[PDB]
Amino acid sequence: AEKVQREPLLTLVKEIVPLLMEIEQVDMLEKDIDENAYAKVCLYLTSCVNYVPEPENSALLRCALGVFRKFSRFPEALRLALMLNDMELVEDIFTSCKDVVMLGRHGVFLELSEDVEEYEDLTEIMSNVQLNSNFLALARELDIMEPKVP
Amino acid sequence: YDRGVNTFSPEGRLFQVEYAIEAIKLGSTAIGIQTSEGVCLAVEKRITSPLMEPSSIEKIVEIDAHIGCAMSGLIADAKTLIDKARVETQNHWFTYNETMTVESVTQAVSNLALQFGEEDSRPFGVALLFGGVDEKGPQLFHMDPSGTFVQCDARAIGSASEGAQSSLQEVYHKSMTLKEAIKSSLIILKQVMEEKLNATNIELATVQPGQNFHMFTKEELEEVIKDI
Amino acid sequence: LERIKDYLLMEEEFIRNQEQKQEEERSKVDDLRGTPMSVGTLEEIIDDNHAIVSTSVGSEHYVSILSFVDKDLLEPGCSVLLNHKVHAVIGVLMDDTDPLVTVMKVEKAPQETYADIGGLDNQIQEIKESVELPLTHPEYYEEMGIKPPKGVILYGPPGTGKTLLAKAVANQTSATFLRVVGSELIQKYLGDGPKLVRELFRVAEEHAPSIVFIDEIDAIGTKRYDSNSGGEREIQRTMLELLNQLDGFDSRGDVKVIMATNRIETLDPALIRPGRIDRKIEFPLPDEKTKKRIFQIHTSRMTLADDVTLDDLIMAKDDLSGADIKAICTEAGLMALRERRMKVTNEDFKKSKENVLYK
Amino acid sequence: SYDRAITVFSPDGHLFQVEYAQEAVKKGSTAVGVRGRDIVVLGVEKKSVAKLQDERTVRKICALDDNVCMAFAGLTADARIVINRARVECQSHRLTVEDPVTVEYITRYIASLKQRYTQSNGRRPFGISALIVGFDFDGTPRLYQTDPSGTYHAWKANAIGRGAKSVREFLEKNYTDEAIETDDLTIKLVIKALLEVVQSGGKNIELAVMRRDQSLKILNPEEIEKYVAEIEKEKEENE
Amino acid sequence: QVEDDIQQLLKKINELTGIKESDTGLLAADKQTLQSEQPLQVARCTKIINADSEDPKYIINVKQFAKFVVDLSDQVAPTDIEEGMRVGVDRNKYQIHIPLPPKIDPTVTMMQVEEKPDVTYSDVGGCKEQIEKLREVVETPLLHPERFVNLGIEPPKGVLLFGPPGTGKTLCARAVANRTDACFIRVIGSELVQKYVGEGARMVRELFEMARTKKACLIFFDEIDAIGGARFDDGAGGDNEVQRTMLELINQLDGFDPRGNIKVLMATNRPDTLDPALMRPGRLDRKIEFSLPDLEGRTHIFKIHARSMSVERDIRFELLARLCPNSTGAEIRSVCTEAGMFAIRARRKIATEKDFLEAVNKVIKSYAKFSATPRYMTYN
Ligand SMILES: Nc1ncnc2c1ncn2[C@@H]1O[C@H](COP(=O)(O)OP(=O)(O)OP(O)(O)=S)[C@@H](O)[C@H]1O
Ligand SMILES: Nc1ncnc2c1ncn2[C@@H]1O[C@H](COP(=O)(O)OP(=O)(O)OP(O)(O)=S)[C@@H](O)[C@H]1O
């Protein structure tokens, strides 16, 4: 009925406290992208790290991985990689962000965004596959740093 | 602080003539191009209103059967000089059975471009482009309020003369033809005017040793514009 | 249902705002301070927590400071608190109050609104879009990044409603109003013009978002006074100071400036350039239609005897202003209460017409 | 005599008195004029009469010939001088060439006089702006206006006097070819334009026409009243 | 709601939680130090006339009290107690303790700028030669005393500016005052007009006091016509105090031990009523002037006022510049802002060309009856 009413924001933050929110998101997300993504994921990401305790934030991150896995503009999923620190995500976002060919620039804030673990796990599973070898070029070292200094 | 109107400058020039050279700049543009086939010439009318009937504004007026002209800025100061220049060319053909050449016309005009004074008033406010075909081939001539008369091969005046002279020196050379120069002029026109270029904005005036008189009625202008 | 929890926690934050030994520390600050707290005057400040002050007789002392109050509230030309026994800086004194401010700042809701102006409708939207809509609605200008128009000159023949327009802007407002008639910039002492100008705009820039309305400024040039020093060679310097104060240095700020003249041709055009003043608005003698609104509104609150026609009065003078209309609409009432009446007949307007116009 | 130059150029390229004497035109009475194809019409608004006096002397529309008609704005005395000189000139043209005087000639004369008047030694420029409507040979209606600069300048409808911008804006959204189809409608078009101008009580609406094979007829202000009445009837028929 | 109630709960939880420390812990941030400042001294300041020989034996006028012969204390240096020096003197035993900077007349203290108004060099484009010359004078010796020494010259220690009003003088000054790096000191020309005779002279004295104390500084003069331009002499005795102020400005500027590391910028609107003692170089060397931006200047100033505003970029700017033959940058700014204001008449987010044409015929052709420069181009 609130998908009929179409004003989210308050219905969403009410229906957080009843995963329920998982089937709520994949049930709700068909057409409107930036209201749920920007509005819901902004206010509920910020208020979820702000006021809400940790274990429901994993449901935010996984079902947001679902609907953002449906969606484009991948740094939403890369900030999901910031809070998740998941290794499947970088493989999915490199087959998907190689599927969307800027490029070295998301290499740059990829390497800035990533922690110590996932560029070595990334360079070992991409040492296996690599699909063009340019992600072995970018996403270990030396190509965050080759455009900048000149 | 009102000084005498016939005062030079602390730097040297004058005042009122310099202010006349400033007063040219508000006027409408005009472009004339000398070509050995003949002299072509163009102007903008600057139509303001739709109530303003367009075919009545004169920019190209007729001095002789072979000496053309175009005016700028103030209209009516130019009208006096056009009338008088005609009279003096008629005096020359009368007392000499021959055609007063265009340089002699413009010498006769800039003899009293500055006779401005209180006895025997202000300086005139018009820049003039003079063409025609004398015995020395085609001629294109340009004067000023200060009487400093010079020959110009393709001079552009008035409000858009900076880019007109620059982009004109881009396209011009010595061995141009007529129609190439005509469309080369009106390209510059519809880069320097403000309104859409159409049948009513501009008017041409071309005089040739072959096309003996300057003749330019309407709707060959349509044929020239649709050639763009 | 956020009202309950929001109110409980907000009242807790408000009671913790009042929840900011300790009484022993207050008594110790009172022990450091003397009871006869003497007042001094700063001249300079030395950065080593002791500076120079100046007593009321002229004696001056290098004295330390009881540093808990913000000493950086103080500049040269400030008022401090000092001791008798050691002359030390007890602390800051709040500022003296405030004859220039109380004189030059209109405090009150100052008369009627746009329901009283007689049929302008185009000048009104210009001053609206220059002062009211910028200040009260500062959201459109962010969209285009365009700075608001700075200055507005009202001008026209006398009687057209410059003063009304200023009062109507001062009615519907949200800013501090500052009114100085321009004829108060002519002083019988030398060098008193720039002092008034710098104090005026100091008040404006220090207090608030503001509207400085400077009325009848054209009389500063065309009125020489015997009660003066050397006239034009001081008046010109005063105008030059007003000029530099209006569009000089250092990030002008949130100060609106509206000026009103009768004649405009006797003005030094250096004020009248844009960058200072962007809108110049003509006030003509209106028509024979908005006169009906003027007579209507100036007869809207009276027991008008309906045996009169206002079109008899519109035709009367060919160049009457709202001044003449107010004058007749009040003089007819003065004729009415001369003979203990309430309603106003036609001959009242006739006598009022023959009293206002032709005398 | 008076050896001085009154009108000096500006430091930024103007004639002060030519551009500034247009203001005296700008603060005068309004007058419009259109041409239909067979009947010409013009008239002035804002007589601003005292409603109780003579009116045969304040006539702002006169004629120079049996072919040509006047109108003006600005101050009336300079118009009186220019009209006297124009009458002399048109009749002296009739002295020579045996035609009726062409309108283009008399407009060139007025503008030429005005320019050599502004040019000369110490003569104050004429702060008027005339309208010269006539229909010369083979019945061609034409109408020109003047300017204190001295630029005869052919139009199709008028915009001078007080608030001429508003009047030309109404003529702008009223340039219908249909309006110059019915002579009566052209008269009513002048009445509606002047009605979109000042009070237009039907008192200061002084209008005169010429059907190009006759002389000027000044209309009696009862016919203009019925014209305004049928204009108000069509305005009611608009709703 | 959830952010509001949860932020209220969290912030007031921190507040009411530190309330336990507020009601449990029972100014003194300096109290023991201030009571150790109770063995300090009141230290009344004075003025020294002269010294004596073979011994200190110093002589002091206090300010009003009397004049006393004193001796120095033991915690002083016997050297820097020279004459005319405001020193702090003991109240009881009358002995000198510390020399200090002199009297600065605090109504002159408030014209040092103390801030930096944000005006960049990009805002005066289209005046390249003027920017070049004024850069050459003002910026280069304070940042690079290299070419000026290794070739053996002296840079021109004074630069005057003029032109029509609203041409960029004030704006260029502020552009320098952004990147000045020096002690930039503003002076309005009306600051030197006081009630009493020869008082503005003392103001100029204190200006050059501050100038000589702090090396490598800038002083900006502004509208120097009030300071004094002509010495019209009649049997009336009129404008004279202004004239003495102007002469005192002359002498302490340049002549008989010149100025030091100070540069003076003046700026007037009418550089024609000036006494040629100022026109002598050595005081006012480079005559940098601002004419009107001729053709490309106005294109560039349209690029300046247009680069950060909501317009339709499909239009041109050259046609706009071609309709503004004698116009200042202020009129350009009014054109841009007024075109925006015509866009506010409708409800749009982008300008049109017609909006700018309305702006041109709104500003230039309408208010050209005032226009501020048909009688300042002649420099009346
Ligand atoms: N347009 C108007 N409509 C109604 N009343 C008006 C109008 N213009 C003036 N008034 C009357 O005039 C009074 C205001 O005087 P102003 O016209 O503002 O005088 P003023 O001529 O502006 O004085 P100045 O500014 O020194 S010339 C009001 O009390 C009104 O009664
Ligand atoms: N050449 C220019 N380029 C860009 N903006 C300019 C230019 N000239 C003036 N302006 C703008 O218009 C404003 C007015 O210039 P100012 O220098 O402040 O005038 P001014 O120097 O006070 O002239 P006065 O009245 O003689 S002191 C500047 O602050 C700029 O915003």
Write a brief structural summary.
This is part of a larger assembly, with chains A (150 residues), B (228 residues), C (359 residues), D (239 residues) and E (380 residues). In chain B, 31% of the residues lie in helices and 15% in strands.
Annotation keywords:
part of a larger assembly, 5 chains, D: 239 residues, alpha+beta, Glutamine Phosphoribosylpyrophosphate, subunit 1, domain 1, four-stranded antiparallel beta sheet, E: 380 residues, alpha/beta, five-stranded parallel beta sheet, 12 helices, 11 strands, 35% helix
How would you portray this structure in words?
Chain A contains ten helices and no strands. By secondary structure, chain A is an all-alpha fold. Chain A is elongated, with a radius of gyration of 17 Å. Chain B has a single domain (1-228), classed as 4-Layer Sandwich (Glutamine Phosphoribosylpyrophosphate, subunit 1, domain 1). Helix content of chain B is 31%, strand content 15%. Chain B has a four-stranded antiparallel β-sheet, with helices on one face. A three-stranded antiparallel β-sheet of chain B has the order 1-2-7, covered by helices on one side. In chain C, the strands form two sheets. Chain C has a six-stranded mixed β-sheet with strand order 6-8-9-10-7-11, sandwiched between helices. Helix content of chain C is 36%, strand content 15%. With 239 residues, chain D is of the alpha+beta class. Chain D has a single domain, classed as Aminohydrolase, N-terminal nucleophile (Ntn) domain (Glutamine Phosphoribosylpyrophosphate, subunit 1, domain 1, 4-Layer Sandwich). Helix content of chain D is 36%, strand content 13%. In chain D, the strands form two sheets. A four-stranded antiparallel β-sheet of chain D has the order 1-2-7-8, covered by helices on one side. A four-stranded antiparallel β-sheet of chain D has the order 3-4-5-6, covered by helices on one side. In chain D, strand 7 (206-210) and strand 8 (217-218) form a beta hairpin. In chain D, 43% of the residues are buried. Chains in contact: A-E, B-D, B-E, C-D, C-E, D-E. At the C-E interface, helix 1, helix 2, strand 1, strand 3 and helix 5 of C face helix 1, helix 2, strand 1, helix 5 and helix 11 of E. Bound molecules: phosphothiophosphoric acid-adenylate ester (2 copies). One phosphothiophosphoric acid-adenylate ester (AGS) is lined by residues 117-118, 158-164, 216, 260, 262, 294, 321-323, 326 of chain C.
> H/E series of chain E, N to C?
HHEEEEEEHHEHEHEHEHEHHHH
Number of strands of chain E: 11
Class from helix and strand fractions of chain E: alpha/beta
Q: Name the strands of the widest sheet of chain E in spatial order.
A: 1-5-6-4-3-2
Strands side by side in the biggest sheet of chain D: 1-2-7-8
Rounded to an integer, what's the Rg of chain D over CA atoms?
19 Å
Q: What small ligands are held by the chains?
A: phosphothiophosphoric acid-adenylate ester
- Percentage of β-strand residues of chain E: 5-15%
Q: How much of the sequence of chain D is in beta strands?
A: 5-15%
Order of helices and strands of chain D: HEEEHHEEEHHEEH
What's the number of helices of chain E? Answer: 12
Task: Quote the CATH topology of chain D.
Answer: Glutamine Phosphoribosylpyrophosphate, subunit 1, domain 1
- Please name the two chains that share the biggest interface, counting residues whose Cβ lies under 8 Å from a Cβ on the partner chain: C-E, 80 and 96 residues
Q: Tell me, what's the shape of chain D?
A: globular
By DSSP, the count of extended strands of chain D is 8
Provide the domain count of chain D.
1
Gap from first CA to last CA of chain E: 67 Å
Family (chain E): Belongs to the AAA ATPase family.
Organism (chain E): Homo sapiens
InterPro entries (chain E): 26S_Proteasome_ATPase, AAA+_ATPase, AAA_lid_3, ATPase_AAA_core, ATPase_AAA_CS, NA-bd_OB-fold, P-loop_NTPase, PRS7-like_OB
Subcellular location (chain E): Cytoplasm
